[PDB]
């Protein structure tokens, strides 16, 4: 490739326990799943939208976020895999797919260190090889 652009990202989730099981629906946790840049940039320059596919137990399980922050906050009772798909401003630039296990329950290791939220997050890089002129400009602004 003549131009290679690497965009580091962090994705995953945070979760917080209610201290009790809610009577109405059995929900125990609030959680937020997200994708963010690793560096301080405006990702929307080159990201068109990010889609998050939730478990079928959720209403409207295919969620779309079109502007930063690219996050979904929900409540629930169970862990499950979320599929994340990142679309670019050039429709012909192949979207990126990420796989994340939504984490609710804290390790004893972290509990004993006084952590009161669960954070499960992962570093990755999106790699663009010879993107269009328009994409190159927006990736480098």
């Amino acid at each position: 490739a003549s131009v290679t652009i690497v965009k580091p990202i962090v994705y995953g989730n945070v979760a917080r326990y209610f201290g009790k099981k809610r009577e109405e629906d059995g929900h125990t946790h609030q959680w937020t799943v997200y994708v963010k840049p690793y560096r301080n940039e405006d990702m929307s320059a080159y990201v068109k939208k990010i889609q998050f596919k939730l478990h079928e137990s959720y209403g409207n399980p295919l969620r779309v976020v079109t502007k930063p922050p690219y996050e979904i906050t929900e409540t629930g009772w169970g862990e499950f895999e979320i599929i994340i798909k990142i679309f670019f401003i050039d429709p012909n630039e192949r979207p990126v797919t990420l796989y994340h296990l939504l984490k609710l329950f804290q390790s004893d290791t972290n509990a004993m260190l006084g952590k009161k939220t669960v954070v499960s997050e992962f570093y990755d890089e999106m790699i663009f090889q010879d993107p269009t002129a328009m994409m190159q400009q927006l990736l480098t602004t």
Binding site: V6, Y99, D124
Partner: peptide
């Protein structure tokens, strides 16, 4: 675009 990491196993 492609990613650095595989789908379900990461460095």
């Amino acid at each position: 675009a492609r990613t650095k990491q595989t789908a379900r196993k990461s460095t």
